[PDB]
Amino acid sequence: NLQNGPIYARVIQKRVPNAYDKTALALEVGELVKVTKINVSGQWEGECNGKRGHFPFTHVRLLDQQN
Numbered sequence: 001n002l003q004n005g006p007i008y009a010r011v012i013q014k015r016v017p018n019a020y021d022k023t024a025l026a027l028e029v030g031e032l033v034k035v036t037k038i039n040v041s042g043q044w045e046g047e048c049n050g051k052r053g054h055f056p057f058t059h060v061r062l063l064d065q066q067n
Helices: none
Strands: 009-011 031-038 043-048 051-056
Antiparallel strands (some): 009 031, 031 043, 043 051
């Protein structure tokens, strides 16, 4: 499934989206986000806390549900 795919990256920083940004993804420190396409510029775009757009992965943590 996509909604609850394998990718499990949580957030630790709360960053507000720009006013002039429609496809912007909001980030709330301490939340579950599952992007769709990881960029090489540190920007992951996809699914974030049930939202769609682009967010600075430089303010989030990624995990593979494996401890």
